Amino acid sequence: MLNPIVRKFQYGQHTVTLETGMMARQATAAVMVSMDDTAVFVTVVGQKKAKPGQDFFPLTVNYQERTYAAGRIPGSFFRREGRPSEGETLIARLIDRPIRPLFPEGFVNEVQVIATVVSVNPQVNPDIVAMIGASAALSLSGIPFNGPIGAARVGYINDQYVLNPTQDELKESKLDLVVAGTEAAVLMVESEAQLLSEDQMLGAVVFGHEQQQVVIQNINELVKEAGKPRWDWQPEP
Amino acid sequence: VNEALNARVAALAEARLSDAYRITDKQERYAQVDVIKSETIATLLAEDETLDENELGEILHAIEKNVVRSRVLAGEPRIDGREKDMIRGLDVRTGVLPRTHGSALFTRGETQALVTATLGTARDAQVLDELMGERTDTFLFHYNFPPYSVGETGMVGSPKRREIGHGRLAKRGVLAVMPDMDKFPYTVRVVSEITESNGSSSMASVCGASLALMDAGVPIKAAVAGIAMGLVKEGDNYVVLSDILGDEDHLGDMDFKVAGSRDGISALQMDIKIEGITKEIMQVALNQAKGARLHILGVMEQAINAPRGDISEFAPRIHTIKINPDKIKDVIGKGGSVIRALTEETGTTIEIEDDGTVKIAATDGEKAKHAIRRIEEITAEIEVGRVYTGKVTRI
């Protein structure tokens, strides 16, 4: 009865896997994205009836890290880490920044994206898994959205670029740079560098964008195999 | 009463609502009802500038509830097609998340709970001050109800007895069947997140918890499942509903939640809003609930028969080995040098506890085996006297 549709590709020595249909079937769209052992459950809800008074786009993105995802008891005072920390709020911003301008002009429907981390291998960071999950969850829904986004983290080691470095390789690297972009163009870059030249930084951005394309190929295969029909939404005249 | 407006709207709608509820398709019914509704909504708006949703909706919803009400008492299929004794369709899958100590998805029609178990050391137990006397809990239950579960936007976290009720009912349901601390030394936390809900999702967390604990390999004394029940009464006539949706709340005059194993109740909750319930009615109500609860526990047992012998590889495994007590020295070393060497390379915490007993711990089995293997070639070591084939390492 319940039947999950899975498309597993490969990506920088790890193997991402996308699952749909099985759970939160009453949300507009829901995706369990998982690279190696780091798994994150990402869900979109958007209301079809636009509030008659409204004149801006109320997009909300929430990223939460369940402690059971690392097999540890909370052992804390404040609502067992109820409020979102700095460490969570920043990752929500990393998802918001590339998404927000990619909705069409004059869209004003309320949309909410929730990413919950449900498993973590300590070597593979869940943030850029949450980013490709948000991309999947928006693109699977009917919601009018200008194509899927990839995400990639690039490191620099022994004068070679490295895609998706593990949390141990990162400490040897003299760069930590995230890219998000479409088929057409880069949308967002954020970086730390140990005094690299401006040429080396743009080399990293190009290298990241050239191979986040494999995420876009696989997301589009899932969308036409398991995607809901597009909303009959038109721009305000 | 304001009956004149009540009478006119009833005459316009009742005859058409009582038609619409016979329709087999959930969606066409909804569509046909929402049209009849707005029409006589507007048509009497013609007669005067009478009230809007402020009164119309109300006078209407009531006609609807009375309609389902009479249909159920008479003996007609309920709003979802099922009769008065059929728990909805069940699907159950276990080990659904990688690298959690044990985890399960329980589904009953539109309701789902994703549930996970986690093992802590005795140090991770919650200790609490209360006026009736301070307490230490080795079993911990948490219940999360995010807004997407009901198909709505809003605050991702909102605290209500909607959650502390369901957080406490579920804990009482499972606590009865937990192993005693002398059989099972670990503290255990279970967390249930309601991925989707049609009202009655507390009992789905009891069923999901029983699966998650068996998967983790906690030696629970039997499987435990729960059922959400309702009873409709009008004059002397009554009917008991075996599994009840988030919108048939209006039908229930007494609704009771019961949880337990194949051979006894572990928790019971009841609320009676209408007078003239008697012990005879409560007796047959629980006797029907038992039939339904015994069905669910059958499907759960088919998915997973018994708790597994292996504690999850990732979950910590308390153990100790008796190595030669005199050989302590070459596992300590001057200034603890070979403790520092072993602990840092192997990534494993090591102790000598009592008369040559070694205690050793890590997240990975790989690290533990590495450390054990390393200490079994310094101590308790195969070096009795017989000839050994050595690879020449350095000259």
Author numbering:
A (entry chain A): 1 to 237
B (entry chain B): 238 to 632
The authors write:
Polynucleotide phosphorylase (PNPase) is an ancient exoribonuclease conserved in the course of evolution and is found in species as diverse as bacteria and humans. Although PNPase can catalyze the polymerization of nucleotides, its main cellular function is the 3ʹ-to-5ʹ degradation of RNA (Grunberg-Manago et al., 1955). While the catalytic core performs the phosphorolytic action, the KH and S1 domains participate in RNA substrate capture and autoregulation (Wong et al., 2013) and are powerful facilitators of PNPase activity. Cryoelectron microscopy (cryo-EM) was used to solve structures for E. coli PNPase in the apo- and substrate-bound forms and in a ternary complex with sRNA substrate and Hfq (i.e., the RNA carrier complex).
Structures of E. coli apo PNPase have been limited to the catalytic core and parts of the KH domains (Nurmohamed et al., 2009). A full structure has remained elusive, but it has been assumed to have flexibly tethered KH and S1 domains protruding outward from each PNPase protomer. The structure of E. coli PNPase in apo form reveals for the first time the wide conformational landscape of the KH and S1 RNA recognition modules.
